[PDB]
Amino acid sequence: DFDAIIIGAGFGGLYSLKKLRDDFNLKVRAFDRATEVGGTWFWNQYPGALSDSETHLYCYSWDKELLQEMEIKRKYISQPDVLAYLKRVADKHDLRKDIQFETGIRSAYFDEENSFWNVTTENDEKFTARFLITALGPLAAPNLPKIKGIETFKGELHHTSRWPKDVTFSGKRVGVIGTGSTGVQVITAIASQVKHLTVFQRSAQYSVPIGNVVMSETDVAKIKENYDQIWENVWNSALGYGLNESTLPTMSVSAEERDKIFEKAWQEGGGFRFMFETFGDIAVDETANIEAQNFIKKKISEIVKDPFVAKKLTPTDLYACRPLCDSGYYEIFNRDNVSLEDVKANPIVEIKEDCVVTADGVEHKLDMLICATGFDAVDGSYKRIDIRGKDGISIKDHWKDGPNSYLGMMVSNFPNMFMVFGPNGPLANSPPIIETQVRWIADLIGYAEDHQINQIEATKDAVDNWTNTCSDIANKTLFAKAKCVYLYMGGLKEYRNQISEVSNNNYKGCLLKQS
Ligand SMILES: Cc1cc2nc3c(=O)[nH]c(=O)nc-3n(C[C@H](O)[C@H](O)[C@H](O)COP(=O)(O)OP(=O)(O)OC[C@H]3O[C@@H](n4cnc5c(N)ncnc54)[C@H](O)[C@@H]3O)c2cc1C
Ligand SMILES: NC(=O)c1ccc[n+]([C@@H]2O[C@H](COP(=O)([O-])OP(=O)(O)OC[C@H]3O[C@@H](n4cnc5c(N)ncnc54)[C@H](O)[C@@H]3O)[C@@H](O)[C@H]2O)c1
Structure with missing residues (x-):
């Protein structure tokens, strides 16, 4: 048994583990298919991998000692330096003892009686936990091209998501x-x-x-x-x-x-x-x-x-x-x-x-x-896991016609579910978004621990209102008549206020069951 099972050990999953375990004294276990923390920064090591955000802003803000200790070598931080920073985050706070590496997640089934999740790994092992936080990030499965003859190439074949070690370039036609x-x-x-x-x-x-x-x-x-x-x-x-x-x-x-x-x-x-x-x-x-x-x-x-x-x-x-x-x-x-x-x-x-x-x-x-052909959308990271909530309805059917959520963190029919960097989130720098969502989710679980409640769930009508204010702002921009699978475009400040309007009004739009 656990209070929370974390899926993902990247930016979101690491701070989700720190918050629930250290700041709320919960028994938490994190999982990841990888063998080390980092998320996309562990998987993507192609030549030239570099952040869109500047170095002093692509990090955590909650650890003030880390900020004063942080290396700032260049204006933007490269992939190896990001992995080292996230490795130092795991070292300085002793997180690694609560993540199980090399362990994927096959199925996540919600139990409607005892009100917890049934999370089965790919090693035929399952764990039980009241809450299940999902930090899968935005990148999903690598969209490789559909080209006749792909199997017949006798030379080196690399997708940028699975970039191998010791790749040499000199003298080669690439x-x-x-x-x-x-x-x-x-x-x-x-x-x-x-x-x-x-x-x-x-x-x-x-x-x-x-x-x-x-x-x-x-x-x-x-x-x-x-x-x-x-x-x-x-x-x-x-x-x-x-x-x-x-x-x-x-x-x-x-x-x-x-x-x-x-x-x-x-x-x-x-x-x-x-x-x-x-x-x-x-x-x-x-x-x-x-x-x-x-x-x-x-x-x-x-x-x-x-x-x-x-x-x-x-x-x-x-x-x-x-x-x-x-x-x-x-x-x-x-x-x-x-x-x-x-x-x-x-x-x-x-x-x-x-x-x-x-x-x-x-x-x-x-x-x-x-x-370097990209990947699928954020829902693919969720559709790839067998997540069955109420009625046993799987995550693929409820999102068969596009993704949706409430505040970008919770889905209807899927109670005790909280999403980090999920769909219908804000368009902004990811570390401030991840910090904002992990704080909001954790304090709701704290409200849950104190008021003796065992099942939280967003209403179908609240996620409809949230998808309406997202299309409300989006249709003010030309991001509909361009390349644009949905986002909230009110900004980080307006997003911080909107979820505060929820966490102040006793979590309006959320079902709260007692036992
Ligand atoms: C090169 C590069 C540069 C980037 N620069 C920026 C930037 O400047 N600004 C910005 O805002 N964003 C940027 N991004 C986007 C990036 O995805 C964010 O940093 C994102 O928030 C990463 O944090 P995360 O942990 O939420 O996602 P991820 O790091 O993708 O976390 C996902 C983890 O969950 C694990 N996982 C998923 N499913 C399962 C399963 N079924 N079982 C077990 N484990 C599972 C995966 O192994 C993965 O490690 C960049 C991405 C890349 C690749
Ligand atoms: N912070 C950063 O600097 C950074 C670095 C890497 C990735 N990212 C993010 O991760 C996502 C990954 O994007 P990406 O750079 O992998 O590419 P992408 O997902 O933006 O698009 C894939 C690219 O491959 C090309 N392509 C796709 N299918 C093709 C086909 N069949 N034939 C020929 N060309 C084809 C497309 O023209 C497209 O430009 C992006 O949305 C980006 O926002 C950010």
């Missing part, structure tokens, strides 16, 4: 499929190392510089001397990225100054900065979003010297959501050993034993094929 944030980071990292690189681009996207400069002793001292300060701005901001969230409209100024505002954010770096520190209407106004696109379009023309390759790298969408961040991505295509292949116009139809064959018939002889 091909990369996918031009997302993962594909961009791999391409800039390896193009200088390979004999020839081939980029199979299905859809071009906008990418801004990241500016990952080294941090000086004075820079790190300026941050740590003012750390209580930086975090208060995070809870008061909408994105939690430490940005000067602008309200100035794009078209309410001269073209000479509009170019100055874009160029300043272009020089400082960051995808969210170029979109939300510049002006405050890029994500709502059609004219504003066009202006931001043309600045990146103009930038693409200046860097890519070949106009035909520059035309290939230019996105064709009428509306653009959040761009990517890069450390010299458009600069890569100026090299003698880099070839861009518009795969939307020249699709891959077959890959033979030693090459990739596009529709035009050209065989692209590769020694190694990297798959």
Whole structure:
């Protein structure tokens, strides 16, 4: 028996374990298929893996001693340094004794009599616990392409989610499929190392510089001397990225100054900065979003010297959501050993034993094929586990027509269930979101321990209201008429208030059963 069983040992699962065990004296056990904490930062070790958020903000805020002790080597933190930080979090607080590694979760069945969950691992072992917190993160199963001939490639085949150890690049003809944030980071990292690189681009996207400069002793001292300060701005901001969230409209100024505002954010770096520190209407106004696109379009023309390759790298969408961040991505295509292949116009139809064959018939002889093709949505991480709640209804049937939840943390028909970084959550930096949700969930379990209650459940009507206020805000933006499987877009501050409006009104919209 346990009070809580944690599924996941990443950012969410680690702080969920710390809170329930140490701050509430509960008997908790965490599980993970991995052999070490980290989550996506343990699984994804591809070349160039780097955070969207800056180093001083992509961490935990609750441990003040850790913040003053934290290493800040560069403006953004690389994957090995994130794993080391999360390893130190597990070390300093002795969490590892309460996680069982190499242990997946097959089924999670809610018992309607004693009001607890039946969690069966993949080792034919099951445990019982009143509460089941689920910290599976946003990334799910790796969406690999459906290409004829995938099995016949005799060379190295790697998807970025399962990047193996000891991969050498020199002297090899390497091909990369996918031009997302993962594909961009791999391409800039390896193009200088390979004999020839081939980029199979299905859809071009906008990418801004990241500016990952080294941090000086004075820079790190300026941050740590003012750390209580930086975090208060995070809870008061909408994105939690430490940005000067602008309200100035794009078209309410001269073209000479509009170019100055874009160029300043272009020089400082960051995808969210170029979109939300510049002006405050890029994500709502059609004219504003066009202006931001043309600045990146103009930038693409200046860097890519070949106009035909520059035309290939230019996105064709009428509306653009959040761009990517890069450390010299458009600069890569100026090299003698880099070839861009518009795969939307020249699709891959077959890959033979030693090459990739596009529709035009050209065989692209590769020694190694990297798959940076992304993953599935957040619901896939849940649909992959046999979660049966009330009536024995499985998580696949209740979410068969898209995911939904109440405050992004609880589902109807699934009582005693609390989701960390679940669907219908806020669009912001993940560590502030995870800290916000683990605090809200834990204090509700504390209210549960004190008032002698054994079953909490959200109503079907509350999750309908929550999905209505999510579409309420979303339809104010062009994120519907663009690339966009649902999100709350009111900001971190409004999200912190909304769940406080619930936890103050005696948890309105939640069923509370006594025994
Ligand atoms: C390279 C990279 C950079 C990123 N940068 C940013 C950023 O700058 N800002 C940002 O906000 N987000 C970023 N993200 C998103 C990232 O997923 C967040 O950090 C996320 O919150 C990770 O925390 P988590 O523990 O909630 O998710 P995860 O770390 O994905 O936790 C999931 C864990 O649960 C385990 N698990 C799942 N199902 C089962 C099962 N059935 N049985 C056993 N174990 C299971 C998995 O093994 C996994 O370890 C980035 C992601 C990547 C890959
Ligand atoms: N913080 C960071 O910098 C960072 C790093 C990695 C990932 N992420 C997040 O994780 C998610 C993973 O995204 P990702 O970078 O893996 O890519 P993605 O999920 O954004 O998209 C996959 C990419 O592969 C390409 N692709 C997919 N199927 C294809 C096919 N059949 N043929 C050719 N091309 C194909 C698409 O054009 C797309 O650009 C992203 O949503 C991102 O937000 C963030």
